[PDB]
């Protein structure tokens, strides 16, 4: 449990006024895991910190690169070469000194996913950009009823107003989600039920993909960050709904 | 014109692969003004910097407050008490050391708007949260054909997926936009044309307001800023393509 300080109420008074006092405590007591701290995940982590989430785990083994500058909140001249997750953790500690931040300097694999998820998270935000670990994470959380929201590919898109949430089985214009569905089926026996759903919530966009315009898909902050923000809003909404139901 | 360095191409290669080389050059050559560096404007400024916009002016006179923490990108423990616009300017120089960043430590008034807009901006992003200077800024840019995107109320809302852009005359569920229309009409003679349009593009949300001095969330206020920036870039690219 987290005791909400007077400082915490100064930082997050606007949160309490928007979501309610019960939600402020719910968020303070929550532990959310963000897997992948890149074009989508770095903004998700920022949003969690700024909405009074009391414990955040960040999982990534990558370093900050100069080419991250177009789409990642931690990508600053002075951060290049440092571990992404550690850089983001330090920022979170500046946002909320009372937030409990854990860094896992690793990638999720079929072999370690149970270990890393054994912490008992309130929610998992899957912002992984490669299919093999993404499938392992999703299959595990789905099997174990761990609340999860995943994100499709956020590159090759310029319009943030077309971003929305649907079941993973129903995404369009998203090659990553399409590969992911194939891998879930072939490697984990995850297939859609009678209603044509996989039972996995996925942030995606109706926008037709914009192919590389210069000599891999490009990306923009305005879209990749909004993927991350929509994932966070979705998660908090589901957490509040569950709490109201119990 | 701006000569794009090797360093610039490394930072914004992803931008070039999304929008094209001509647009990369267009952005590098652009000068965009953000008025109000708060819950909406700070994220707009961030987005401009990370999309290779070559010159950015920031206008705000307020300081970073601890109560900004829920919704403003510059609100960090070590920044509290410093001028928002200078903090954001310093951050932009960390994003792109070659960006030409100007800080105007002031608020826009009917009396100073001409001076501050005479610079010749490629686009103005209006992220002011109070009606009187907001109307004055919009009236001036509209009269002078200065490209402008304005933002409605972003507080009291939890759903980023209902944010959109339309003409200011057609917004709904937005008390700030409604007040703004009234003040524009009464004080500046700005009224709807034959097609029912004011000729002002407005970012707003269809979401019904949530009453508790509204609360706010980063996920929504930042997305207002991002949508404003994407809208401006879309219009800039279209104009360049016409010509
Ligand atoms: N298996 C994994 N576990 C954790 N993070 C990952 C994994 N695979 C990829 N990521 C991260 O996801 C991010 C993708 O960002 P982007 O380049 O914007 O697609 C990068 O920071 C990667 O290091
Ligand atoms: N007349 C004005 N000119 C420039 N900036 C302003 C003006 N009025 C308000 N602002 C700023 O707009 C921001 C609004 O942010 P928020 O508190 O999230 O609504 C604050 O940083 C204000 O200081
Ligand atoms: K899409
Ligand atoms: K609204
Ligand atoms: Na939308």
CATH number, domain at A68? 3.40.50.720
Contact B52 A46 (CB under 8 A): no
Which bound ligand lies closest to the C-alpha atom of B130?
Answer: 2
What does R_g of chain A's alpha carbons equal in angstroms?
Answer: 17
Domain holding A158, by residue range, is: 1-246
Q: Name the residue among B19, B71, B226 with its Cβ closest to that of A50.
A: B71
Nearest residue in B to A203, CA atom: B161
Chain B residues with CB under 8 Å of A45 CB are none
**Gap between the Cα atoms of B91 and B87, Å rounded:** 6
Q: Phi first, then psi: give them for residue A131, nearest 5 degrees.
A: -70, -40
**Gap between the Cα atoms of B137 and B148, Å rounded:** 9
Q: In sequence order, what are the residues at sequence separation of 6 or more whose Cβ sits closer than 8 angstroms to the Cβ of residue A66?
A: A75, A80, B7, B10, B11
**HSE-up of B28 (CA within 13 Å, CB side)?**
22
What does R_g of chain B's alpha carbons equal in angstroms?
Answer: 17
Q: In sequence order, what are the residues at sequence separation of 6 or more whose Cβ sits closer than 8 angstroms to the Cβ of residue B162?
A: B205, B206, B207
**Gap between the Cα atoms of A150 and A190, Å rounded:** 15
Q: Phi first, then psi: give them for residue A214, nearest 5 degrees.
A: -150, 160
Q: In sequence order, what are the residues at sequence separation of 6 or more whose Cβ sits closer than 8 angstroms to the Cβ of residue B188?
A: B135, B136, B139
| Contact call for residues A73 and A42 (beta carbons, < 8 A) | yes
| Contact call for residues B85 and B58 (beta carbons, < 8 A) | yes
Q: In sequence order, what are the residues at sequence separation of 6 or more whose Cβ sits closer than 8 angstroms to the Cβ of residue A62?
A: A37, A38, A83, A84
Find where tokens 């490209």 sit: B147
Mutate to test the interface with B, among A42, A151, A160 (most CBs of B within 10 A): A160
Which bound ligand lies closest to the C-alpha atom of B174?
Answer: 4
Which residue's CA is minimally distant from atom 13 of ligand 2? B38
**Gap between the Cα atoms of A181 and A168, Å rounded:** 8
Which bound ligand lies closest to the C-alpha atom of B173?
Answer: 4
**Residues recorded for chain B:** 243
Tell me, using a 6 A CB cutoff, whether residue B186 lines ligand 2: no
For CA atoms B132, B138, B143, B144, give the dihedral sign.
positive
Structure tokens at A92: 């979170």
| Contact call for residues A24 and A215 (beta carbons, < 8 A) | no
Which residue's CA is minimally distant from atom 18 of ligand 2? B39
By CB atoms closer than 10 A (0-12, 13-18, 19+), residue A191 is exposed
Which residue's CA is minimally distant from atom 3 of ligand 2? B107
Distances (CA, A) of A32 to A71, A102, A148, A236: 22, 10, 10, 10
Nearest residue in B to A78, CA atom: B94
Q: Name the residue among B20, B51, B69 with its Cβ closest to that of A11.
A: B69
Nearest residue in B to A71, CA atom: B50
Residue A229, SS3? helix
**Gap between the Cα atoms of A80 and A87, Å rounded:** 10
Q: b/e string for A138-151 if b means 16 or more Cβ within 10 A?
A: bbbbbeeebbbbbb
Task: Provide the CA B142 distance to its chain's centre, in angstroms.
Answer: 15
Structure tokens at A153: 């590919």
Chain B residues with CB under 8 Å of A15 CB are 70, 215, 217
| Contact call for residues A69 and B11 (beta carbons, < 8 A) | yes
Residue A111, SS3? coil
| Of the candidates A9, A91, A107, the residue with the CA atom closest to the CA atom of residue A45 | A91
Strand B123-126 versus strand B55-59 pairing type: unpaired
DSSP, residue by residue, chain A:
--PPPHHHHHHHHHHHHHH-HHHHHHHHT-EEEEE--STTHHHHHHHHHHTT-SEEEEE--PBP-GGGGGT-TT--GGGTTSBHHHHHHHHHHHH-TTSEEEEE-S---TTTHHHHHTT--SEEEE---SHHHHHHHHHHHHHTT--EEEE---SS---GGGEEEEEGGG--S-HHHHHHHHHHHHHH-----TTS--S-EEEEE-SPP-----------HHHHHHHHHHHHHHHHHHHHHHHHH-
Find where tokens 């019960």 sit: A22
Q: In sequence order, what are the residues at sequence separation of 6 or more whose Cβ sits closer than 8 angstroms to the Cβ of residue B1?
A: B29
Task: Provide the CA A137 distance to its chain's centre, in angstroms.
Answer: 12
Structure tokens at A40: 């989508």
Structure tokens at B88: 């954001």
Residue pairs spanning A and B at CB distance below 8 A: 192
Strands of the sheet containing A100-104, edge to edge, are A100-104, A55-59, A31-35, A123-126, A148-151, A201-205, A163-167
Contact A229 B215 (CB under 8 A): no
Residue A32, SS3? strand
Helix or strand (DSSP H, E) at A101: strand A100-104
SS (H, E, C) B100-142: EEEEECCCCCCCCHHHHHCCCCCEEEECCCCHHHHHHHHHHHH
Distances (CA, A) of B116 to B62, B132, B142, B189: 17, 17, 15, 22
**Gap between the Cα atoms of A74 and A65, Å rounded:** 10
Residue A198, SS3? coil
Chain A residues with CB under 8 Å of B210 CB are 18
For chain A, how many structural domains are there in total? 1
Structure tokens at B12: 């914004």
**Gap between the Cα atoms of A50 and A11, Å rounded:** 8
Residue B26, SS3? helix
| Contact call for residues A46 and A127 (beta carbons, < 8 A) | no
| Of the candidates A125, A104, A18, A2, the residue with the CA atom closest to the CA atom of residue A53 | A2
| Of the candidates A45, A105, A65, the residue with the CA atom closest to the CA atom of residue A227 | A45
DSSP H helical segments within A20-167, as ranges? 21-28, 41-50, 84-95, 113-117, 131-143
Report A:193-212 residues touching B (Cβ under 8 A): 210, 212
| Contact call for residues B219 and A17 (beta carbons, < 8 A) | no
Q: How many CB atoms lie within 10 A of CB A170?
A: 13
**Gap between the Cα atoms of A128 and B132, Å rounded:** 45
Q: How was this structure determined?
A: X-ray
Structure tokens at B221: 């206020």
Q: Report the first-to-last Cα separation within chain A, whole angstroms.
A: 18
Structure tokens at A154: 């956020």
| Contact call for residues B56 and B45 (beta carbons, < 8 A) | yes
Q: Chain A: nearest CA to B186, how far in angstroms? A: 32
| Contact call for residues B149 and B203 (beta carbons, < 8 A) | yes
Distance from Cα B227 to the centre of ligand 5, integer Å = 10
Distances (CA, A) of B192 to B126, B170, B173: 20, 10, 19
Structure tokens at A56: 């955040």
Q: Chain B: nearest CA to A109, how far in angstroms? A: 28
Resolution for this experimental structure (Å): 1.8
């Amino acid at each position: 449990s987290v005791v909400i300080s007077d400082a915490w109420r100064q930082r997050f008074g606007g949160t309490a006024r928007l979501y309610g006092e019960k939600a402020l405590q719910l968020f303070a007591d929550a532990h959310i895991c963000v897997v992948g701290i890149g074009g989508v995940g770095s903004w998700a982590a920022e949003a969690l910190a700024r909405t009074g989430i009391g414990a955040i785990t960040l999982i990534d083994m990558d370093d900050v690169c100069v080419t991250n500058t177009n789409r990642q909140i931690h990508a600053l001249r002075d951060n290049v070469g440092l571990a992404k997750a550690e850089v983001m953790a330090e920022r979170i500690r500046q946002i909320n000194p009372e937030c409990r931040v854990t860094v896992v300097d690793d990638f999720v694999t079929p072999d370690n996913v149970a270990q890393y998820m054994s912490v008992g998270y309130s929610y998992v935000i899957d912002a992984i950009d490669s299919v093999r670990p993404k499938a392992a994470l999703i299959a595990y959380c789905r099997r174990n009823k761990i609340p999860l929201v995943t994100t499709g590919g956020a590159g090759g898109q310029i319009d943030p107003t077309q971003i929305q949430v649907t079941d993973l089985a129903k995404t369009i214009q998203d090659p990553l989600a399409a590969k992911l569905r194939e891998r879930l089926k072939s490697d984990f026996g995850v297939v859609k039920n009678s209603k044509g759903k996989l039972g996995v919530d996925c942030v995606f966009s109706t926008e037709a993909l914009v192919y590389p315009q210069s000599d891999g898909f490009g990306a923009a902050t305005m879209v990749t960050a909004t993927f991350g923000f929509v994932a966070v809003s979705h998660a908090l909404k589901k957490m509040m709904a569950k709490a109201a139901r119990q």
